[PDB]
Amino acid sequence: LNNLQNIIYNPVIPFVGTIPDQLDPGTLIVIRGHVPSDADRFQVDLQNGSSMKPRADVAFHFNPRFKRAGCIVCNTLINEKWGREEITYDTPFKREKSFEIVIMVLKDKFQVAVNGKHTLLYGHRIGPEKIDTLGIYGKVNIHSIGFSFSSDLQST
Ligand SMILES: C=CC(=O)[C@H](CO[C@@H]1O[C@H](CO)[C@H](O)[C@H](OS(=O)(=O)O)[C@H]1O)NC(C)=O
């Protein structure tokens, strides 16, 4: 409900960048982009740091996959080992279609909407205060990355 504040337009992919502010409850991450016609998958990762080796922990891996029926895989990476996947089969992403992802950080979970329709929840596995880095990888065109805040949904 606050005005969007974009940090970057048209970032080169893979993108890695520092998040300006701590992801307190009510924070919104807003990502606009387009799925190329040949995309197999892309991901948005909320990371504890940016190291590639040992690979930084990923508090929240949000991973649309386009083969077969399509799905979104969510998971957490700790010390270079993935945990148990949570798979959402009702996916709104399609090759050759554009999207607006809104990741809402709540007290107990992430709530993700795409094109304004609720898509999935992911309970926190590590504290969101450990997140300082946003990564975007794979086959995706990103138009903008920005941050907002909602006091309404801040406590729910
Ligand atoms: C098709 C592959 C598999 O199931 C496993 C798990 O596949 C991983 O699944 C994770 C989410 O659980 C990440 O998506 C990850 O991708 S990564 O580039 O972020 O590291 C991806 O390989 N793969 C193996 C045994 O080799």
Task: Name the experimental technique.
Answer: X-ray
> What pairing do the DSSP bridges indicate for beta strands 141-149 and 133-138?
unpaired
Cα–Cα distances in angstroms (integers) from residue 32 to residues 6, 24, 127, 145, in the given order: 10, 21, 26, 7
Task: Give the angle 10-12-16 at the CA atoms, nearest 5°.
Answer: 110
**Contacts for 80 with CB less than 8 Å, ≥ 6 apart:** 54, 55
Task: Give the angle 138-114-130 at the CA atoms, nearest 5°.
Answer: 65
Residue 70: CB atoms within 10 A of its CB come to: 17
Report the distance separating Cα 3 and Cα 70, nearest Å.
32
Resolution, angstroms, 1 dp: 1.3
| Secondary structure (DSSP) of 74-127 | EEEEETTEE---EEE-S----TT-EEEEEEEE-SSEEEEEETTEEEEEEE-SS-
Q: Answer yes or no: are the C-beta atoms of 59 and 48 closer than 8 Å.
A: yes
User: In the structure, which protein residues have their CB atom closer than 6 angstroms to any atom of ligand 1?
Assistant: 43, 61, 63, 73, 75, 82, 85
Ligand 1 atom with the shortest distance to the CA of 41: 14
43, 73, 82, 84: residue to mutate for ligand 1 pocket, most atoms within 8 A of CB: 82
